[PDB]
Amino acid sequence: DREDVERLLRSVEWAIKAGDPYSARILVELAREDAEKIGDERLRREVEELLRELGPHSMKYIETAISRPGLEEPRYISVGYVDNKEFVRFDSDAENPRYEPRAPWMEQEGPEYWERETQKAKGQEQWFRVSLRNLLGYYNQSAGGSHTLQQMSGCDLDENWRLVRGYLQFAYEGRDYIALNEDLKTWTAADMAAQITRRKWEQSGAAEHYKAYLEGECVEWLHRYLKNG
């Protein structure tokens, strides 16, 4: 219905604002098919305008899981960016899903790098499908509709390639849900459901795991990416 399409449209704006046109485009193509069967002129128009819309350093990975009523299992997408430029990509829809280089400078990382990145994506796929099922209960919404879960994580660096900000924030139905604070120690919860998540994650010390990544491996491999390009 229209409510499904508005959720898809909200996720487009989030995907656009987070810097991933690959998932923004898949999402708006979904919303555009739905709008043309429904026949809502304002929605149809909102699809076109988003269709129209489509030193310091940074690395971010934007991850997307999309549940549709004909999808026995959701699609899972992950696209990584260095200084706003795509360098790696995984899509659960490929005949052989795996991370693949999108930049020429990435083609000198060898086999062990790619198998482990792909292992991470296969675990993320299962994490997103479990969390989607959890959110459905939190909000008491019906499984038949469309639903999206989106994640952005990574780091910003100053002129000296030093950490200025680590980030790890989630969207559900294209709306802000939970976000790691700049202390990398506490969480901001954007609604009542997310307060259940925050409690859980505070109680199990989940922030610590993400802090270690953002301040360690994340900066460390961005440095190497920055010198390889």
Partner: peptide, 9 residues
């Protein structure tokens, strides 16, 4: 290198 999540939502 990508992050990998721990506790589910």
């Amino acid at each position: 290198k990508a992050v990998y999540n721990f506790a589910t939502m």
